[PDB]
Short mmCIF file of the C-alpha atoms (twelve columns), coordinates in Angstrom:
data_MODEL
# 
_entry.id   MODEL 
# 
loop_
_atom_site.group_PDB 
_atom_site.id 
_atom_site.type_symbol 
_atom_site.label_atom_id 
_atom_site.label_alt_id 
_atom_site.label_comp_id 
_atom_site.label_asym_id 
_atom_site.label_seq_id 
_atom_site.Cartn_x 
_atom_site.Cartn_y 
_atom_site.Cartn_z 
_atom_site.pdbx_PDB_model_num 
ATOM 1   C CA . UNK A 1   0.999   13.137  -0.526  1 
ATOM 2   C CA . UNK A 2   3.214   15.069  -3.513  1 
ATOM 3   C CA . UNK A 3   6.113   15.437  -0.706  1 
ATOM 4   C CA . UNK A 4   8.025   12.415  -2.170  1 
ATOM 5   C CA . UNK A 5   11.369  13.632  -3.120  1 
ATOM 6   C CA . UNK A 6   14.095  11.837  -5.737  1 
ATOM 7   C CA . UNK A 7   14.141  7.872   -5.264  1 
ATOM 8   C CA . UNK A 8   16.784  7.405   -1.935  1 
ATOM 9   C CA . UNK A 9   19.248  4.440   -1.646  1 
ATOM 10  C CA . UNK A 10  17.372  3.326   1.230   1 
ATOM 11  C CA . UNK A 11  15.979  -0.522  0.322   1 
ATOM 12  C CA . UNK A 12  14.413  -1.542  3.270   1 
ATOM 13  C CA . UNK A 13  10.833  -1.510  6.219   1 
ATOM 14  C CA . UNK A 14  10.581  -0.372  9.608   1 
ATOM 15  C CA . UNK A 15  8.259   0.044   12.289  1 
ATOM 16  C CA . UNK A 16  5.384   -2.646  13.604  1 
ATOM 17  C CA . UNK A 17  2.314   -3.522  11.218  1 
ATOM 18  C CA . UNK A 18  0.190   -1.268  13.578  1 
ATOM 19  C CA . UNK A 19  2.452   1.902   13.437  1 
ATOM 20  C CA . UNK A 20  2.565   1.568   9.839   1 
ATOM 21  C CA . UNK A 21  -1.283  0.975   9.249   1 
ATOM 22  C CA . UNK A 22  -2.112  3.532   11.310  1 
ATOM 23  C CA . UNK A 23  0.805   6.347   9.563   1 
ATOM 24  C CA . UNK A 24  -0.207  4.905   6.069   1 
ATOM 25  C CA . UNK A 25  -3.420  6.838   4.184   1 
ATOM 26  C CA . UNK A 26  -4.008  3.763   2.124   1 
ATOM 27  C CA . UNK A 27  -4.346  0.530   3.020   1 
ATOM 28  C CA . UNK A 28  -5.719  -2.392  1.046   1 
ATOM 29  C CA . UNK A 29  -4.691  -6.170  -0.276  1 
ATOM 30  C CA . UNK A 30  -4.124  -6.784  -4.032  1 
ATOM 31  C CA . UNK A 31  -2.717  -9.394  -6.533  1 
ATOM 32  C CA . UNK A 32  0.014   -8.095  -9.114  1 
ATOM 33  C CA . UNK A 33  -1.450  -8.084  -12.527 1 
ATOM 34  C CA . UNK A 34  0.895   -6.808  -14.399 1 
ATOM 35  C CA . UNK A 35  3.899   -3.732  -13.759 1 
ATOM 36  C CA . UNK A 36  5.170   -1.017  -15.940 1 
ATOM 37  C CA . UNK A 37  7.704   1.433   -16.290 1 
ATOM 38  C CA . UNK A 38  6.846   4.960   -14.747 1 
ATOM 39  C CA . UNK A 39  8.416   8.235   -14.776 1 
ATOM 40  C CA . UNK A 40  11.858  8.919   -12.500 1 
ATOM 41  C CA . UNK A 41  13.044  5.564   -10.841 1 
ATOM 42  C CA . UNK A 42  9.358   5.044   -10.475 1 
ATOM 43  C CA . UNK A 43  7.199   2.095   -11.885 1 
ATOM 44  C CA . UNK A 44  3.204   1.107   -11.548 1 
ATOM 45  C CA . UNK A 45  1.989   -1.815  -10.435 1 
ATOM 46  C CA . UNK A 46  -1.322  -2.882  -12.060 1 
ATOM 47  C CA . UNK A 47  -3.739  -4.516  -9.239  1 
ATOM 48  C CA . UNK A 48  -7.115  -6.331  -9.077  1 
ATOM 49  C CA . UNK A 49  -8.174  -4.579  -5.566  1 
ATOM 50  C CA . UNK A 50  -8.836  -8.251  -2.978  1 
ATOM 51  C CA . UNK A 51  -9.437  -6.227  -0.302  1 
ATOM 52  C CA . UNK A 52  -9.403  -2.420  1.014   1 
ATOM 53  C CA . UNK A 53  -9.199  -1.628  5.073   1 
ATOM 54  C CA . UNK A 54  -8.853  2.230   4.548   1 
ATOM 55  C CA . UNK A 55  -9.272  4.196   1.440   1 
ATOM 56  C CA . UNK A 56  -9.591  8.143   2.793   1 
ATOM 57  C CA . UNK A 57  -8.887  9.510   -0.448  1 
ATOM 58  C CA . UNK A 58  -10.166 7.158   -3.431  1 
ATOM 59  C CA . UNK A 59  -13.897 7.602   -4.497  1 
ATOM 60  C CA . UNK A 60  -14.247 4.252   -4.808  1 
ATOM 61  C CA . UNK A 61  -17.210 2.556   -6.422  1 
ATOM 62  C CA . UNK A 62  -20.955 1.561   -5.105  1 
ATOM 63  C CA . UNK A 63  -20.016 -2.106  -4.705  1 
ATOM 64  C CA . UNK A 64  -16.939 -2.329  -2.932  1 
ATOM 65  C CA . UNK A 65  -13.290 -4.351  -3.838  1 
ATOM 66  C CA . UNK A 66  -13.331 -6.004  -7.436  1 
ATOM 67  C CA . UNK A 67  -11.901 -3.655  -9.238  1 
ATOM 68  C CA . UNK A 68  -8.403  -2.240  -10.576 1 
ATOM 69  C CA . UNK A 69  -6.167  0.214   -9.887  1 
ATOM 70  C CA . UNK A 70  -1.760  1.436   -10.825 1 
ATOM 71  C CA . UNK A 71  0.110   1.837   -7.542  1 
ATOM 72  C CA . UNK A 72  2.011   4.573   -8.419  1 
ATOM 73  C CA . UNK A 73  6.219   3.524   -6.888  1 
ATOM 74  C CA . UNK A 74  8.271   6.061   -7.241  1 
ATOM 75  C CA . UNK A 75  11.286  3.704   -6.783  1 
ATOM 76  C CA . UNK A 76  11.564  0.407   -8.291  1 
ATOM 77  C CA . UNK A 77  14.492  -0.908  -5.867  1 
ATOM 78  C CA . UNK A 78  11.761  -1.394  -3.121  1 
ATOM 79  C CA . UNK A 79  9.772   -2.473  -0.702  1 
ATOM 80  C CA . UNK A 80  9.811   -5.457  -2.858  1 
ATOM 81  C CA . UNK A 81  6.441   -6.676  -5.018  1 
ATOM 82  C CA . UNK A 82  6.717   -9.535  -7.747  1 
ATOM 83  C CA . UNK A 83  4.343   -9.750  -10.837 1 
ATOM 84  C CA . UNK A 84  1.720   -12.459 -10.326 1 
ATOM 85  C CA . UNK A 85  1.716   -13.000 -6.681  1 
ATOM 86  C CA . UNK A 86  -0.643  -11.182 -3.622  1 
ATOM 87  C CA . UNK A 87  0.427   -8.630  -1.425  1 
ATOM 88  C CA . UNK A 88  -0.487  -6.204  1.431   1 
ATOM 89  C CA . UNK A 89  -0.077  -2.442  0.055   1 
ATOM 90  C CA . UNK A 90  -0.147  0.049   3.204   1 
ATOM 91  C CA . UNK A 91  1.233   3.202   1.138   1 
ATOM 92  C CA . UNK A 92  -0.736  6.776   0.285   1 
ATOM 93  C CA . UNK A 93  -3.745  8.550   -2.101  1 
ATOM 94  C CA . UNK A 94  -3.348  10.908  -4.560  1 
ATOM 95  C CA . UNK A 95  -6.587  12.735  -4.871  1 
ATOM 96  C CA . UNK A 96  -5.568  13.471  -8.361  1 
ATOM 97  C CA . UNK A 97  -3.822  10.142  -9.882  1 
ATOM 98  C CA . UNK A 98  -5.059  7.460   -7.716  1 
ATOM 99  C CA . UNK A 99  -3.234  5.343   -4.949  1 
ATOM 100 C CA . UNK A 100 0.894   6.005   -4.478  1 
ATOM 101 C CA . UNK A 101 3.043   3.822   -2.924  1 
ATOM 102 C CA . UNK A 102 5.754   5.676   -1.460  1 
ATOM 103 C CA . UNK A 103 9.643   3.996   -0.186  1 
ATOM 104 C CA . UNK A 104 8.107   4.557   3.319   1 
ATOM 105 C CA . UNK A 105 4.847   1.780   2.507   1 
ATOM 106 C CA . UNK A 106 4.751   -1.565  4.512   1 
ATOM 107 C CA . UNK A 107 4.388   -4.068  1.637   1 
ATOM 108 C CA . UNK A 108 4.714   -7.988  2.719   1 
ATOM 109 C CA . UNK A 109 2.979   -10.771 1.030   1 
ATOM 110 C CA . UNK A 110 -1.031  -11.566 1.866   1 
ATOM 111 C CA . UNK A 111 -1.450  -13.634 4.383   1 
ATOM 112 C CA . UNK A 112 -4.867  -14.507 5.971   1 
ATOM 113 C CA . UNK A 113 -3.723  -13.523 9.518   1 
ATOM 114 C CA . UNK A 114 -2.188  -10.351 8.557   1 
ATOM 115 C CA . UNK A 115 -5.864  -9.881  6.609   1 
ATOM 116 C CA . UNK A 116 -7.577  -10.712 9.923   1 
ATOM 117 C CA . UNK A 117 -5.596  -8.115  11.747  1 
ATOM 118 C CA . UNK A 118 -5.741  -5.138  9.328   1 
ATOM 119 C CA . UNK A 119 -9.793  -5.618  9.254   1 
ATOM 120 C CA . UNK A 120 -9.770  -5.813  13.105  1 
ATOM 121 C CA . UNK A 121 -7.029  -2.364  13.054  1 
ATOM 122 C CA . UNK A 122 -9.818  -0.550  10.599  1 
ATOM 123 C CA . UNK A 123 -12.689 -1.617  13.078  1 
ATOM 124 C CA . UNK A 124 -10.552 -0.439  16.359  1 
ATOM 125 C CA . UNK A 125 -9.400  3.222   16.312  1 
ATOM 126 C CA . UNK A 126 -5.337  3.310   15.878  1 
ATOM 127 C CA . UNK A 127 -4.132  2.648   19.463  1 
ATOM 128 C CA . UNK A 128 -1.947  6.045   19.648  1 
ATOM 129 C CA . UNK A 129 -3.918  8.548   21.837  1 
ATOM 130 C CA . UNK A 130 -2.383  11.203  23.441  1 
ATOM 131 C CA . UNK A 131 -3.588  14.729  25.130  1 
# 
């Protein structure tokens, strides 16, 4: 979504893990390989891919999770990441330049329940119907 504007102050989450899944266009589970510097206040985050719940905008392999990827931050004062340690990505695609991960993405470390959950949220449709 290229409707990120300059980096904000803002340093912090919102919302519940479903509301968030379900706003988010890109939602996977990765280790931190290794991060460098990016354009603005931005910085990448080099990935390994160790799981993928929803990926409408990355033409992703045959064979599925294995393989890397650069989240693309825009602002390096959060949601916090670390080098060398697993996390849950819920952020955006850029059919263009690959995954984004906007200030507005959910990012927490992996946990097998959280896992769990996301896999059962990409089974179930997004509990948010209206008429």
């Amino acid at each position: 979504s290229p409707d990120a504007p300059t980096c904000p102050k803002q340093c912090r989450r919102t919302g519940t893990l479903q509301s968030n899944f379900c706003a988010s266009s890109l939602v996977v589970t990765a280790t931190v390989k290794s991060m460098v510097r990016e354009p603005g206040e931005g910085l990448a985050v080099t990935v390994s891919l160790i799981g993928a719940y929803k990926t409408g905008g990355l033409d992703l392999p045959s064979p599925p999770t294995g393989a890397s990827l650069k989240f693309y931050v825009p602002c390096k004062q959060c949601p916090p990441m670390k080098k060398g340690v697993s996390y849950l990505l819920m952020g955006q695609v850029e059919e263009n330049r690959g995954p984004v991960l906007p200030p507005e993405s959910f990012v927490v470390l992996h946990r097998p329940n959280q896992d769990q959950i996301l896999t059962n949220l990409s089974k179930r449709k997004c509990p948010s119907q209206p008429v």
